Amino acid sequence: QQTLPVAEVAQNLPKKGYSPFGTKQSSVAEWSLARLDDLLNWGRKGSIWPLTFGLACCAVEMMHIAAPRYDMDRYGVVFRASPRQADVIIVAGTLTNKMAPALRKVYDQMPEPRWVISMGSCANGGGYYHYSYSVVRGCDRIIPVDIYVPGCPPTAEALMYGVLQLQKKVKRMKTLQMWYRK
Amino acid sequence: SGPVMYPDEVTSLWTVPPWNSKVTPVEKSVRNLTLNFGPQHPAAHGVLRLVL
Numbered sequence: 618q619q620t621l622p623v624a625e626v627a628q629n630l631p632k633k634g635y636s637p638f639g640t641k642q643s644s645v646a647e648w649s650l651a652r653l654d655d656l657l658n659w660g661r662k663g664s665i666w667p668l669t670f671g672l673a674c675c676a677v678e679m680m681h682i683a684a685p686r687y688d689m690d691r692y693g694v695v696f697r698a699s700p701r702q703a704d705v706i707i708v709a710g711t712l713t714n715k716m717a718p719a720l721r722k723v724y725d726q727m728p729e730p731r732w733v734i735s736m737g738s739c740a741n742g743g744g745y746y747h748y749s750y751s752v753v754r755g756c757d758r759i760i761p762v763d764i765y766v767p768g769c770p771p772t773a774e775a776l777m778y779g780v781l782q783l784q785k786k787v788k789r790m791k792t793l794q795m796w797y798r799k
Numbered sequence: 800s801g802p803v804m805y806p807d808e809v810t811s812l813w814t815v816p817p818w819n820s821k822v823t824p825v826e827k828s829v830r831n832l833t834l835n836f837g838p839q840h841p842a843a844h845g846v847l848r849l850v851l
């Protein structure tokens with residue numbers, strides 16, 4: 618555990634910059650691949666397209682980032698009906714026994730790269746229906762999850778916190794530098 | 800009374816045409832297209848499977 622720095626210490630530190638991979642990497646090819654990766658992650662963290670999925674009550678909150686108080690289209694985020702035209706599936710609601718192959722098929726038909734936001738307590742770990750017969754204990758055991766939005770109804774502030782943390786995860790996602798070091 | 804005057808080997812297996820010239824078409828079974836408004840469909844509200 619570390620805390621946020623004091624303003625004198627914060628004035629001592631320099632600016633972080635946009636690039637999470639640093640300014641220089643002591644090679645021309647490494648710098649070129651890092652800047653290409655920065656451009657690619659800027660194009661990917663800008664306008665992730667979530668999927669019209671909406672299993673349950675947490676979905677009603679999902680329209681409160683559609684609703685003009687929070688405005689998910691300001692961030693590039695915009696809903697698409699088909700899973701082929703989507704980067705993100707927001708698994709939000711109760712995942713039951715009949716929806717296990719449905720969610721697995723919709724996730725598998727969605728093309729790479731794939732990031733899944735788990736919104737709500739039922740999608741995280743079953744929640745208030747954890748000890749029931751029909752509810753799958755979270756959506757981790759069927760599909761991978763990158764972001765766990767924790768509130769049962771999350772505030773749309775807390776859902777866009779998960780969306781912005783997904784954007785920061787895509788911003789730190791590195792593939793071309795990995796290709797150079799593989 | 801045959802289909803023809805002189806039945807050959809191929810021809811004699813035929814039947815007589817009906818004396819009424821009108822032959823009504825039969826009613827055959829039809830299998831329609833099975834499309835489901837599944838759960839991903841936005842008109843199906845997320846968790847409805849209409850097997851239309």
Ligand code: SF4
Pocket residue numbers: 673674675676709710711736737738739740744745768769770771
């Ligand atoms: S996590 Fe809470 S708000 Fe979301 S579907 Fe479950 S009960 Fe409803």
